[PDB]
Protein backbone atom coordinates (compact mmCIF):
# COMPACT_ATOMS: atom_id res chain seq x y z
CA UNK A 1 0.00 0.00 0.00
CA UNK A 2 2.91 2.35 0.75
CA UNK A 3 4.45 1.58 -2.64
CA UNK A 4 1.11 2.38 -4.29
CA UNK A 5 0.88 5.69 -2.41
CA UNK A 6 4.47 6.97 -2.40
CA UNK A 7 5.22 5.93 -5.99
CA UNK A 8 8.19 3.94 -7.25
CA UNK A 9 11.07 4.60 -4.89
CA UNK A 10 13.58 4.19 -7.71
CA UNK A 11 13.79 7.60 -9.37
CA UNK A 12 13.51 7.88 -13.15
CA UNK A 13 17.14 9.02 -13.39
CA UNK A 14 18.26 5.98 -11.36
CA UNK A 15 16.25 3.57 -13.53
CA UNK A 16 17.52 5.19 -16.74
CA UNK A 17 21.10 4.93 -15.45
CA UNK A 18 20.63 1.25 -14.51
CA UNK A 19 19.02 0.48 -17.87
CA UNK A 20 21.76 2.34 -19.77
CA UNK A 21 24.50 0.51 -17.84
CA UNK A 22 22.84 -2.81 -18.67
CA UNK A 23 22.50 -1.85 -22.36
CA UNK A 24 26.15 -0.81 -22.63
CA UNK A 25 27.31 -3.95 -20.81
CA UNK A 26 25.24 -6.34 -22.95
CA UNK A 27 26.36 -4.50 -26.09
CA UNK A 28 29.99 -4.80 -24.97
CA UNK A 29 29.54 -8.56 -24.43
CA UNK A 30 27.98 -9.13 -27.91
CA UNK A 31 25.05 -10.81 -26.17
CA UNK A 32 22.41 -12.42 -28.37
CA UNK A 33 18.92 -12.12 -26.81
CA UNK A 34 17.23 -15.40 -25.91
CA UNK A 35 14.52 -16.15 -28.51
CA UNK A 36 11.07 -17.52 -27.87
CA UNK A 37 11.01 -21.35 -27.77
CA UNK A 38 10.31 -22.28 -31.38
CA UNK A 39 7.89 -24.99 -32.46
CA UNK A 40 10.76 -26.50 -34.48
CA UNK A 41 13.07 -26.51 -31.44
CA UNK A 42 14.94 -29.82 -31.41
CA UNK A 43 15.53 -29.74 -27.64
CA UNK A 44 11.98 -29.25 -26.31
CA UNK A 45 11.55 -32.86 -25.16
CA UNK A 46 14.70 -33.07 -23.03
CA UNK A 47 14.11 -29.69 -21.39
CA UNK A 48 10.56 -30.90 -20.66
Amino acid sequence: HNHMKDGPYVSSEEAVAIYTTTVHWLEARKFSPIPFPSVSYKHDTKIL
Binding site: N2, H3, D6, Y9, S11
Partner: peptide
Amino acid sequence: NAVILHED
Protein backbone atom coordinates in the same frame (compact mmCIF):
# COMPACT_ATOMS: atom_id res chain seq x y z
CA ASN B 1 10.27 16.54 -3.89
CA ALA B 2 12.57 14.14 -2.05
CA VAL B 3 12.02 10.38 -2.03
CA ILE B 4 10.87 8.77 1.22
CA LEU B 5 11.55 5.04 1.35
CA HIS B 6 9.26 2.59 3.13
CA GLU B 7 11.80 1.81 5.87
CA ASP B 8 12.31 5.44 6.94
